[PDB]
Amino acid sequence: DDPPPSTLLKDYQNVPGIEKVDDVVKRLLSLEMANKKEMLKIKQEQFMKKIVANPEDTRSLEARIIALSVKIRSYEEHLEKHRKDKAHKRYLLMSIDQRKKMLKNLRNTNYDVFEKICWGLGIEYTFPPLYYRRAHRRFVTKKALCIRVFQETQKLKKRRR
Amino acid sequence: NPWVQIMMFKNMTPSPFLRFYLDSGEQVLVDVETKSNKEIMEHIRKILGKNEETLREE
Amino acid sequence: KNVLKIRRRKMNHHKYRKLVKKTRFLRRKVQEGRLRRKQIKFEKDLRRIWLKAGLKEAPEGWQTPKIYLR
Amino acid sequence: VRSSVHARWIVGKVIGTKMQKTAKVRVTRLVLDPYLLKYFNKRKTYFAHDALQQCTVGDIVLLRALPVPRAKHVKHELAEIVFKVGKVIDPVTGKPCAGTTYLESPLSS
Amino acid sequence: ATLNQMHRLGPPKRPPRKLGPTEGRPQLKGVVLCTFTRK
Amino acid sequence: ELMAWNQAENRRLHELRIARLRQEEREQEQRQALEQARKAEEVQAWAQRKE
RNA sequence: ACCACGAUCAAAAGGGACAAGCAUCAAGCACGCAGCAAUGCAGCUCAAAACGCUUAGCCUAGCCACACCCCCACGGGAAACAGCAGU
Ligand SMILES: NC(=O)c1ccc[n+]([C@@H]2O[C@H](COP(=O)([O-])OP(=O)(O)OC[C@H]3O[C@@H](n4cnc5c(N)ncnc54)[C@H](O)[C@@H]3O)[C@@H](O)[C@H]2O)c1
Ligand SMILES: [K+]
Ligand SMILES: [Mg+2]
Ligand SMILES: [Mg+2]
Ligand SMILES: [Mg+2]
Ligand SMILES: [Mg+2]
Ligand SMILES: [Mg+2]
Ligand SMILES: [Mg+2]
Ligand SMILES: [Mg+2]
């Protein structure tokens, strides 16, 4: 869920007396009167506060993962409307691959932070396939038949025994 | 030592170290931080290397 | 650069395209016969599998799809 | 005399945990190329009995030969986990670490 | 090629030697069918 | 005997490591104080401009 | 030794190692695991070359394989020099 449009900008949230200003100023300094980038910044700050131990450290692997996750969400939202944007499709796929690499490194280095990142960002880590080969029609049909034949063999063996 | 399984690991711990596994199940840990390669060779030869007497006997 | 090689490539390609045009109809029959034989080979391999497994017939509900006919 | 299994003590990385109480471990040895005279890694897969199913994909484990094979491919048992994946404890100092950085400082104790 | 590539490919694999008209034999016996001349 | 000697060498190296780490911690404390003051100054300027 | 304690030698079984060419042979199709069993899980091998075709006796104090053919030899084809000499 996006931050409410009434939320203040990241740069105008700790200003002293920001709650003592007029409603018009509040509207002007809110996400309603800003581009999508400020709203993505607010998502990034929220995720950092919710997940990482030190929200100020943007140099940790977890912080980079959070930032790239926000960017990936932005790319996906763009591509829902812009179906034929090949450049942004490339950017989305590349960002997904980079996040997978960072998640692999985090899993190899800090498993607790890896679990926290996976739970907080709703990321379901998947292990890469062992082999990269085309699944053409012949192979697919043959594999389906082999599975069926194994099932029938199991049934027959159960009946015999 | 052709039959000894040598395996390497990179950037897993803050400091370098060697670990030897023996047939009895005992483990020998050798800290090698701040040590030169020649020093590491001399140390491992001293602690787990056959002495020259055994080699001449063989 | 080798302009003879590129001119040789041009002559070889142009001669080849003349041959396929001349024998386009004979080629189609050869291709369709080859596809028929290839489908038959695929079916024979599948049948070999379920015969070696032990089943006297194909798996129940299985029908070998035609994966090569356009 | 204690076992009929050739490989007595071996160290590997766990690459599979889909079998019940059995871990598929990848073991690398150094083999000399006869022509280039350079040492390259040669891989072998071992099945190790894991009674408690405490092995995770990617962790470095030590396997000890069984007195006899308990199955066709299971000839070893999990003696210990040398390095838990993402939960490494520095053997030199005994402190938790994340890569080359200390999660807990040695001085703190 | 790098050392890794050389290790991967392995030693050069020389194609088998082509057999000549005598098929790798010193001589062959034959029956004359016809005699003629060529230019 | 050799194993005991190796363990003693490990303990000696551990003591040296502790000394070096303490020195590094002191230097880190000093530097971190300096950069923390600089970050505080930058934050103050940022806040003034926003106000 | 023979009284065995055991040495020497060496089968079957278990673990490991082990020729060449072709990837225009790229997928194999049950090739795994756990349980006393009942049974459960869906797994196992493979571009670090599985599966497959072709070639070849080998790593020579020697070793491996074959002993007319059907791998084997109850059985069948059939009537055997790949022992020496010889044709
Ligand atoms: N074939 C695989 O699925 C695979 C899996 C892991 C790693 N690799 C590595 O990729 C390199 C190329 O291997 P190759 O010459 O035998 O393939 P190749 O070029 O000869 O093509 C055969 C198959 O390997 C795939 N392949 C090709 N290049 C790959 C790559 N970089 N990574 C993964 N798959 C690839 C192809 O998709 C194809 O299905 C090797 O170093 C190998 O270690 C390959
Ligand atoms: K025979
Ligand atoms: Mg034997
Ligand atoms: Mg290839
Ligand atoms: Mg061809
Ligand atoms: Mg032959
Ligand atoms: Mg004869
Ligand atoms: Mg016979
Ligand atoms: Mg004779």
Residue A104, Ramachandran bin (φ over 0: left; ψ between -120 and 50: alpha; else beta): alpha
CA dihedral A76, A77, A83, A85 (to 10 degrees): -70
Helix (H) or strand (E) holding C64: none
- Decide: A112 and D103 in contact? Cβ < 8 Å: no
Question: Rounded to 5 degrees, what are φ and ψ at A30?
Answer: -110, 170
CA C67 remoteness from chain centre: 11
Count other Cβ atoms within 10 Å, centred on residue D55.
22
- Decide: B30 and F8 in contact? Cβ < 8 Å: no
Does D101 touch chain B if contact means CB atoms closer than 8 Å? yes
Contacts by F22-29, CB closer than 8 A, 24 or more apart: F22/D107, F25/D105, F25/D107
CA-CA distance, C46 to D53, in Å (whole number)? 39
Question: CA-nearest residue of chain F to B47?
Answer: F2
DSSP helix/strand/coil, C26 = helix
Helix, strand and coil in chain C, % to nearest 5: 70, 0, 30
Does A143 touch chain C if contact means CB atoms closer than 8 Å? no
User: Which residue, A159, A147, A140, A139, is CA-closest to C59?
Assistant: A147
Residue type for A4, please?
A: P
User: Which residue, D8, D21, D4, is CA-closest to D67?
Assistant: D4
CA-CA distance, D14 to D81, in Å (whole number)? 10
- Whether A131 is in the pocket of ligand 1, judged by its Cβ within 6 Å, is yes
Residue F46 in tokens = 């940022």
Count other Cβ atoms within 10 Å, centred on residue D45.
12
Residue E11 in tokens = 């030693």
DSSP helix/strand/coil, D51 = coil
Tell me the three-class secondary structure of chain E, residue by residue.
CCHHHHHHHCCCCCCCCCCCCCCCCCCCCCCCCCCCCCC
Strand partners, D32: D39
Angstrom distances, CA of residue C58 to CA of A138, A152, A158, C45, C62: 17, 10, 19, 12, 7
Radius of gyration, alpha carbons of chain A:
24
Q: Give the total residue count for chain F.
A: 51
- Whether A128 is in the pocket of ligand 1, judged by its Cβ within 6 Å, is no
Task: Give the HSE-up count for residue A103: Cα atoms under 13 Å, Cβ half-sphere.
Answer: 23
CA-CA distance, D77 to D84, in Å (whole number)? 17
- Decide: A62 and A112 in contact? Cβ < 8 Å: no
Pairing of strands D22-32, D39-49: antiparallel
DSSP string, A73-137: HHHHHHHHH-TT-HHHHHHHHHHHHHHHHHHHHHHHH-HHHHHHHHHHHT----PPPS------H
The sign of the torsion formed by the CA atoms of A71, A77, A78, A84 equals: positive
- Decide: A2 and A39 in contact? Cβ < 8 Å: yes
CA-CA distance, D8 to D10, in Å (whole number)? 7
CA C25 remoteness from chain centre: 16
CA-CA distance, E30 to E22, in Å (whole number)? 11
Residue type for D78, please?
A: L
Cβ of residue E24 lies below 7 Å from strand G: no
| DSSP classification of residue C59 | P
Count other Cβ atoms within 10 Å, centred on residue D88.
24
CA-CA distance, D104 to D107, in Å (whole number)? 9
CA A46 remoteness from chain centre: 14
DSSP helix/strand/coil, C70 = coil
| Cβ–Cβ below 8 Å for F2 and B15 | no
Q: Which of residues 9-68 of C touch strand G (CB under 7 A)?
A: 49, 52-53
User: C51 Cβ partners below 8 Å, 6+ apart?
Assistant: none
CA-CA distance, C63 to A145, in Å (whole number)? 9
Q: Compute, in angstroms, the gap from residue E21 CA to the centroid of ligand 6.
A: 23
Pairing of strands D9-19, D22-32: antiparallel
- Whether A132 is in the pocket of ligand 1, judged by its Cβ within 6 Å, is yes
Best D105, D107, D109 residue to mutate vs chain F (most F CBs within 10 Å): D107
Positions of E strands within chain D? 9-19, 22-32, 39-49, 60-65, 74-83, 97-98, 101-102
CA-CA distance, C61 to C42, in Å (whole number)? 18
User: Which residue, D37, F8, E15, A6, is CA-closest to B47?
Assistant: F8
Please report where in the chains the tokens 């080859």 appear, as a residue: C34
- Decide: D100 and B22 in contact? Cβ < 8 Å: no
Residue B9 in tokens = 């690991």
Angstrom distances, CA of residue F36 to CA of C21, F21, F41: 81, 21, 9
Strand partners, D63: D10, D78
Pairing of strands D60-65, D9-19: antiparallel
Residue C54 in tokens = 């032990």
Radius of gyration, alpha carbons of chain D:
17
Of B30, B33, B34, the CB nearest to F6: B30
CA A91 remoteness from chain centre: 14
Helix (H) or strand (E) holding B18: strand B17-21
Count other Cβ atoms within 10 Å, centred on residue B45.
11
Resolution for the entry shown, Å: 2.4
CA-nearest residue for atom 34, ligand 1, is A132
Count other Cβ atoms within 10 Å, centred on residue A146.
15
